[PDB]
Design an enzyme around this catalytic site. Structure first.
Site, PDB file in Angstrom:
ATOM      1  N   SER A   1     -26.976  11.553  -4.043  1.00  0.00           N
ATOM      2  CA  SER A   1     -26.052  12.325  -4.859  1.00  0.00           C
ATOM      3  C   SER A   1     -25.293  11.565  -5.944  1.00  0.00           C
ATOM      4  O   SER A   1     -24.784  12.181  -6.884  1.00  0.00           O
ATOM      5  CB  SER A   1     -25.161  13.202  -4.007  1.00  0.00           C
ATOM      6  OG  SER A   1     -25.887  14.372  -3.661  1.00  0.00           O
TER       7      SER A   1
ATOM      8  N   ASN B   1     -28.316   5.993   6.234  1.00  0.00           N
ATOM      9  CA  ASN B   1     -27.315   7.004   5.920  1.00  0.00           C
ATOM     10  C   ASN B   1     -26.247   6.852   6.965  1.00  0.00           C
ATOM     11  O   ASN B   1     -26.479   7.162   8.114  1.00  0.00           O
ATOM     12  CB  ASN B   1     -27.917   8.398   6.044  1.00  0.00           C
ATOM     13  CG  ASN B   1     -27.037   9.488   5.418  1.00  0.00           C
ATOM     14  OD1 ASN B   1     -25.823   9.316   5.225  1.00  0.00           O
ATOM     15  ND2 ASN B   1     -27.652  10.625   5.112  1.00  0.00           N
TER      16      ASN B   1
HETATM   17  C1  CXU Z   1     -26.321  14.307  -2.341  1.00  0.00           C
HETATM   18  O1  CXU Z   1     -26.448  13.216  -1.799  1.00  0.00           O
HETATM   19  C2  CXU Z   1     -26.613  15.630  -1.593  1.00  0.00           C
HETATM   20  N1  CXU Z   1     -27.596  15.463  -0.473  1.00  0.00           N
HETATM   21  C3  CXU Z   1     -28.761  15.597  -0.635  1.00  0.00           C
HETATM   22  O2  CXU Z   1     -29.234  16.108  -1.682  1.00  0.00           O
HETATM   23  C4  CXU Z   1     -29.719  15.159   0.426  1.00  0.00           C
HETATM   24  C5  CXU Z   1     -29.481  14.910   1.890  1.00  0.00           C
HETATM   25  C6  CXU Z   1     -28.300  14.997   2.856  1.00  0.00           C
HETATM   26  C7  CXU Z   1     -27.749  13.812   3.442  1.00  0.00           C
HETATM   27  C8  CXU Z   1     -26.630  13.918   4.341  1.00  0.00           C
HETATM   28  C9  CXU Z   1     -26.070  15.210   4.651  1.00  0.00           C
HETATM   29  C10 CXU Z   1     -26.631  16.384   4.057  1.00  0.00           C
HETATM   30  C11 CXU Z   1     -27.730  16.263   3.167  1.00  0.00           C
HETATM   31 CL1  CXU Z   1     -28.403  17.722   2.430  1.00  0.00          CL
HETATM   32  N2  CXU Z   1     -30.577  14.532   2.495  1.00  0.00           N
HETATM   33  O3  CXU Z   1     -31.604  14.492   1.524  1.00  0.00           O
HETATM   34  C12 CXU Z   1     -31.035  14.853   0.407  1.00  0.00           C
HETATM   35  C13 CXU Z   1     -31.840  14.931  -0.871  1.00  0.00           C
HETATM   36  C14 CXU Z   1     -25.208  16.227  -1.213  1.00  0.00           C
HETATM   37  N3  CXU Z   1     -24.120  15.264  -1.392  1.00  0.00           N
HETATM   38  C15 CXU Z   1     -23.749  14.678  -0.128  1.00  0.00           C
HETATM   39  C16 CXU Z   1     -22.630  13.642  -0.301  1.00  0.00           C
HETATM   40  O4  CXU Z   1     -21.563  13.961  -0.974  1.00  0.00           O
HETATM   41  O5  CXU Z   1     -22.807  12.461   0.203  1.00  0.00           O
HETATM   42  C17 CXU Z   1     -23.515  15.880   0.859  1.00  0.00           C
HETATM   43  C18 CXU Z   1     -23.545  15.484   2.372  1.00  0.00           C
HETATM   44  C19 CXU Z   1     -22.239  16.733   0.601  1.00  0.00           C
HETATM   45  S1  CXU Z   1     -25.008  16.886   0.494  1.00  0.00           S
END
Ligand code: CXU
Length: 352
Positions: free
Chosen positions: A61, A334
Site C-alpha cells: 500500500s 507482514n
Molecule cells: C495495502 O497494503 C492494502 N493491502 C493490500 O492491497 C493487500 C493485502 C493485505 C495485507 C494485510 C491485511 C489486509 C490485506 Cl487486503 N494483502 O495483499 C494485498 C495486495 C491495504 N492497506 C493496508 C495497510 O494500511 O497496511 C490494509 C491492511 C488497510 S489493506
C-alpha cells in the site's frame, strides 16, 4: 554512520526482528538530509542471499504514495483536476451513483464505500467497468473514509488517461526517472530478479499475484536506497528540477479531509507534529470525515507516513519535513502495523 544513529536503529530493530520473527529487513534513516542504511537477515532464506541496499521489497500500500504523487503531477500538468467528476475520464460510467463522485473522492477514499479490494473475478477491462457500474454506495460522497484499493486504484488509472500513457508508462517517466529511482518498478525486469526478495507468509516464499488495478494501488517494489530518495524527495520538494513533479509532491501532502487527528492526503497521511504516540488489527474502519475547505497546503510540522503490506511483505515510511528527518522500514514478512509505528517513533523521536 553517527554512533547515535547507529545505536537507536540497532536497539529498536533488533528485538523487533526477534519478536516478530522477521526473515529480512532494511532500514534507512534520513538525518538532516543524508541517508544512513541498515540491513539484517535474508532476502531469500533458501538461497541464503542476504538483504542488501540493492534488495527489492514489495511496498504494498505504500505504493499509494507514488500514485498520489503521479496524480498530483497530472493535476499540475493540467491534464486532470481533482474537482472533476469521475465521469469526465470514464464516460461509460453511466450508473447514476457516480454523479457527484469526483477524482478527489477516488483519491482520498471518500467516494462512499468503494470496496477495499477489487474482486479477484474481475479480470478484464469490461469486468472492471461492470464492477464500478454495479457498485452501490453505502454512503454519500464526502461523508466517510473507508480505505480502499479500488478507490485510489481507479484514481491512478484515470489520472494518467488524458496523457495516453499506461500508468506504468507515466510512473516511470514522470516520477521514477526524474527522481533517479533506477531500482523501483511496478514490474520487475528479469535483470532485477536476482534482487527481488521472497516474502514470507506462514513459512512459505510468496510474491504478490496479479490483480485488477494492482500497479495503481499496491504494485511498486523498491530498494531502501530508492525509498530513501523517495523520502528525501518528499522532505524537500523545492529541490526538485521538474516543475510539475515539484507541485505534484506538494499536492499529495495537502490536507483534504480530517478524521480524529489524522489528515488525508493523496496517498500520504498526516498528523500534526509534534504528535502523540497514542495517536499513531481492524481490517476495516469506516470513519466520517470533515472536509477541509479549501485544502491546507502541505504543513512542515507534520508526521507524514504510510503503512502497506502484501501477503509476504510489511513496510513503512515516515518523515517530518520540518526536522528534515525521516525513516523507511522494509521487511519481507507482514507483521503488525503497530510494531512498525512504535519502532519508527522510537528511532525518530530520539533524534529530535
Ligand atoms: C495495502 O497494503 C492494502 N493491502 C493490500 O492491497 C493487500 C493485502 C493485505 C495485507 C494485510 C491485511 C489486509 C490485506 Cl487486503 N494483502 O495483499 C494485498 C495486495 C491495504 N492497506 C493496508 C495497510 O494500511 O497496511 C490494509 C491492511 C488497510 S489493506
Amino acid at each position: 554512520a553517527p554512533q547515535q544513529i547507529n545505536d537507536i536503529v540497532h536497539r529498536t530493530i533488533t528485538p523487533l526482528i526477534e519478536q516478530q520473527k522477521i526473515p529480512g529487513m532494511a532500514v534507512a534513516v534520513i538525518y538532516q538530509g543524508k541517508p544512513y542504511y541498515f540491513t539484517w537477515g535474508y532476502a531469500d532464506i533458501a538461497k541464503k542471499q542476504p538483504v542488501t541496499q540493492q534488495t527489492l521489497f514489495e511496498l504494498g500500500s505504500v505504493s499509494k504514495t507514488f500514485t498520489g504523487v503521479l496524480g498530483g503531477d497530472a493535476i499540475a500538468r493540467g491534464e486532470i483536476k481533482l474537482s472533476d467528476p469521475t465521469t469526465k475520464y470514464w464516460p461509460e460510467l453511466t450508473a447514476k451513483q457516480w454523479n457527484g463522485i469526483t477524482l478527489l473522492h477516488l483519491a482520498t477514499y471518500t467516494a462512499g464505500g468503494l470496496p477495499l479490494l477489487v474482486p479477484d473475478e474481475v479480470k478484464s477491462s469490461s469486468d472492471l467497468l461492470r464492477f464500478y457500474q454495479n457498485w452501490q454506495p453505502a454512503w454519500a460522497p464526502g461523508t466517510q473514509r473507508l480505505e480502499a484499493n479500488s478507490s485510489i486504484g481507479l484514481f491512478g488509472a484515470l489520472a494518467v488517461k488524458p496523457s495516453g500513457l499506461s500508468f506504468e508508462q507515466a510512473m516511470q517517466t514522470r516520477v521514477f526517472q526524474p527522481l533517479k529511482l533506477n531500482h523501483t518498478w511496478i514490474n520487475v525486469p528479469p535483470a532485477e530478479e536476482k534482487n527481488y526478495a521472497w516474502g514470507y507468509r506462514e513459512g512459505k516464499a510468496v510474491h504478490v499475484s496479479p490483480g485488477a488495478l494492482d500497479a495503481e494501488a499496491y504494485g511498486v517494489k523498491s530498494t531502501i536506497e530508492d525509498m530513501a530518495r523517495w523520502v528525501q524527495s518528499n522532505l524537500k520538494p523545492l529541490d526538485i528540477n521538474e516543475k510539475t513533479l515539484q507541485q505534484g509532491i506538494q499536492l499529495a501532502q495537502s490536507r483534504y479531509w480530517q478524521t480524529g487527528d489524522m489528515y488525508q492526503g493523496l496517498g500520504w497521511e498526516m498528523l500534526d507534529w509534534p504528535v502523540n504516540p497514542d495517536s499513531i488489527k481492524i481490517a476495516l474502519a469506516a470513519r466520517p470525515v470533515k472536509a477541509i475547505t479549501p485544502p491546507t497546503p502541505a504543513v512542515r510540522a507534520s508526521w507524514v507516513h504510510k503503512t502497506g503490506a502484501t501477503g509476504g511483505f510489511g513496510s513503512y515510511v515516515a518523515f517530518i519535513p520540518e526536522k528534515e528527518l525521516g525513516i523507511v522500514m522494509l521487511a519481507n514478512k507482514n507483521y503488525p502495523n503497530p510494531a512498525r509505528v512504535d519502532a519508527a517513533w522510537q528511532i525518530l523521536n530520539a533524534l529530535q
